[PDB]
C-alpha cells in the first residue's frame, strides 16, 4: 500500500518515533505497513500495533461520545449534529474495519503460539466491541456475536495455555468482562468474570519474579476498580 516502498525495519523504527512524538495516526499507518509486509509480528511489534490503533480509536470513541450526548440533548422534548456524529462514526468504523482486516489478512491465521493467537483474538473482540458501541442496523446482533465469539476463543486458549497471571490473559478477561457489562447487558457475568479472574491470578502471584508481579498486579487493580464501580 502507501508504505509499500519502505523497509519493514524502517516502518517499525518510525512507529517507535511516532509513539515518542505522540503521533498515533502516523504510528498506526507505519504499523499497518509493517503488517502488510506479510511476516509474523514479534511481541514488541504486536504491542506497537495495538498501542497505535488503541490511541486512534480511543480519540474517535471519545469524540463520538461527546457528539452522541449533544445529539441526544437536541432531540429531547438542524441536521448538523447528526451529520457530524455520523461523519465521526463512519471514520471510527473505517479504523475498526482496517484493524479487523489486518487480523483477517493474515495475522490470526498464521498465529500458532498462545501469546500471539490470544493477543490477536482479544484485538478482534475489542474492535468488534467498538463497532458494537455505535451499531444500530440489521447487523447489530451479529456484530455483538462476533465480539463474543472472538473473546470466547481467546479465553478458551488462554485457560489451556497460559498461567492465570499472564498479562494478556488478564487484559482479555478485563475487556471481555467490560463487553458483558456494557455491550451484552450481562452485569452478573461481567462481575463473575472479573472476580474469578482476580482470585485465580492472586493465588498464582507467588510464582512470579518482581517484574512479572508488577505487570500482573497492574491489571488486577483494573479488575478491582471495575468491581468497585459495579458493586
Amino acid at each position: 500500500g502507501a508504505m509499500g516502498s519502505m523497509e519493514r525495519a524502517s516502518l517499525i523504527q518510525k512507529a517507535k518515533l511516532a509513539e515518542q512524538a505522540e503521533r498515533y495516526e502516523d504510528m498506526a499507518a507505519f504499523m499497518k505497513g509493517a503488517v502488510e509486509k506479510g511476516e509474523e509480528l514479534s511481541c514488541e511489534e504486536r504491542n506497537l500495533l495495538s498501542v497505535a490503533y488503541k490511541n486512534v480509536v480511543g480519540g474517535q470513541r471519545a469524540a463520538w461520545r461527546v457528539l452522541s450526548s449533544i445529539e441526544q440533548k437536541s432531540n429531547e422534548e438542524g441536521p448538523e449534529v447528526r451529520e457530524y456524529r455520523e461523519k465521526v462514526e463512519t471514520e471510527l468504523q473505517g479504523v475498526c474495519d482496517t484493524v479487523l482486516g489486518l487480523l483477517d489478512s493474515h495475522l490470526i491465521k498464521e498465529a500458532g503460539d498462545a501469546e500471539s493467537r490470544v493477543f490477536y483474538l482479544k484485538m478482534k473482540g475489542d474492535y468488534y466491541r467498538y463497532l458494537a458501541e455505535v451499531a444500530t442496523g440489521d447487523d447489530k446482533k451479529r456484530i455483538i456475536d462476533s465480539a463474543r465469539s472472538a473473546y470466547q476463543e481467546a479465553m478458551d486458549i488462554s485457560k489451556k495455555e497460559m498461567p492465570p497471571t499472564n498479562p494478556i490473559r488478564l487484559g482479555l478477561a478485563l475487556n471481555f468482562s467490560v463487553f458483558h457489562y456494557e455491550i451484552a447487558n450481562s452485569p452478573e457475568e461481567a462481575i463473575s468474570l472479573a472476580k474469578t479472574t482476580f482470585d485465580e491470578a492472586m493465588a498464582d502471584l507467588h510464582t512470579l519474579s518482581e517484574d512479572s508481579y508488577k505487570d500482573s498486579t497492574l491489571i488486577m487493580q483494573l479488575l478491582r476498580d471495575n468491581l468497585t464501580l459495579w458493586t
Binding site: 475489542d126 487484559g171 478485563l174 475487556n175 467490560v178 457489562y181 456494557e182 491489571i219 483494573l222 476498580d225 471495575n226 464501580l229 459495579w230
Partner: peptide, 5 residues
C-alpha cells in the same frame, strides 16, 4: 466508564 486495556 470502566477500565479496559
Amino acid at each position: 466508564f470502566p477500565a479496559t486495556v
